[PDB]
Nucleic acid binder design. Structure first.
Length: 372
DNA sequence: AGGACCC
DNA sequence: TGGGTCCT
């Protein structure tokens, strides 16, 4: 019936990794750069105006002192990301990754086992760990409150472990489903945690300022809802099911309307090993359609070392590209093809293997998928 | 192959 | 605007 889900969200992840590499970067405003962008920065620099995904220029003309480290090679970020996930899996096996810095853990079973260990007395001593959303009063006789509180305790144990064993700080949100857990994890933003009691669900959902802010409603859907006059969470909650169903599909429509009410029955999915491996690269439009495949040889280099390490082998390869011109807000192409059973068991072959797929066709990326 | 959505 | 996942 009722679940206890925790959402773990690491603070400015790349920055934390770069700060751990070179300690001299601490306290000093740090920004991690990829090409001409500052993807993320530590809180210090953030205090000085630096915002995530901001042009270097606008970043230095806002903080003419900001230090920058290149973060185009995701290798170390990716490695730490899995150590975090594995550490969480130790607490409970059902852990879902969302990007490199977020994880969802279904704590339901763990909470039950812990509660069954408590005696008819110490159950009244159950306390919360961290913040209680909207400073809501706890009712120790509400079984749902007790469960979420134990959930807050586990969350605190997880964050303490991440810090002690891995040197990382982060936020956590504890709630009855993934939607709410993710929305509440960020209420007290820096290295802290919050728990959501049922009675405050509407307050949390309505605290949002636009449907776009709801996890599960992307750039597209948002614009669709807008063209319909739906802008606030309450608009969506009160809109006609039928029309919404008749314009977004019965699937999408019924799902996002549930979300507007803070309802979300999606299960936390066990991520396990990656379903694919890939590396990209965007050039200043410097690929003459030919000879510029030496770049593809570079991508393959690292990948091959990665595809290797994992142990499993990929039975499919792919190549994706881009083209410069107008304002193509969306434009990618890729030629998918099977990988020779013999070559699976090295570059040379694969090189021209991608080369043919090449000709058949500002960015270039090789993706090894269909792992077995 | 391409699309939507997410960090 | 460097990676990923799942659905059509």
């Amino acid at each position: 019936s009722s679940r206890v889900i925790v959402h773990v969200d690491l603070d400015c992840f790349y920055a934390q990794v770069e700060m751990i590499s070179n300690p001299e970067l601490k306290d000093k405003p740090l920004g991690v750069q990829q090409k001409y962008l500052v993807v993320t920065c530590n809180y210090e620099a953030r205090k000085l105006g630096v915002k995530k995904l901001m042009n270097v220029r606008d970043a230095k003309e806002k903080c003419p002192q900001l230090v920058l480290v290149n973060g185009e090679d995701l290798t170390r970020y990716r490695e730490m990301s899995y150590k975090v996930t594995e550490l969480l899996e130790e607490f409970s096996p059902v852990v879902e990754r969302l990007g490199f810095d977020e994880n969802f853990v279904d704590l339901t079973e763990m909470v039950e086992k812990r509660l069954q260990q408590l005696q008819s007395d110490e159950l009244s001593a159950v306390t919360v760990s961290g913040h209680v959303y909207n400073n809501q009063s706890i009712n120790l006789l509400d079984v749902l409150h007790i469960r979420l509180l134990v959930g807050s305790q586990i969350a605190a144990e997880m964050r303490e472990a991440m810090y002690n064993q891995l040197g990382l700080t982060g936020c956590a949100g504890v709630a009855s489903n993934k939607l709410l857990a993710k929305l509440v994890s960020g209420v007290f933003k820096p290295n802290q945690q919050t728990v959501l009691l049922p009675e405050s669900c509407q307050h949390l959902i309505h605290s949002l300022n636009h449907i776009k802010e709801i996890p599960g409603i992307g750039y597209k859907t948002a614009k669709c809802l807008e063209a319909l006059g739906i802008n606030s969470v309450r608009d969506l909650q009160t809109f006609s099911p039928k029309i919404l169903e008749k314009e977004l599909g019965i699937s999408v429509a019924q799902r996002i309307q549930k979300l507007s009410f803070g309802e979300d029955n999606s299960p936390v999915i066990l991520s396990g090993p990656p379903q694919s491996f890939s590396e990209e690269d965007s050039f200043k439009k410097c690929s003459s359609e030919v000879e510029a495949k030496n770049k593809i040889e570079e991508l393959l280099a690292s990948l091959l070392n990665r595809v290797c390490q994992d142990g499993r082998k990929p039975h499919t390869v792919r190549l994706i590209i881009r083209r410069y011109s107008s304002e193509k807000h969306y434009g990618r192409e890729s030629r998918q093809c099977p990988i020779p059973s013999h070559v699976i068991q090295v570059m040379t072959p694969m090189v021209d293997i991608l080369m043919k797929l090449f000709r058949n066709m500002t960015l270039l990326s090789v993706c090894f998928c269909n792992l077995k």
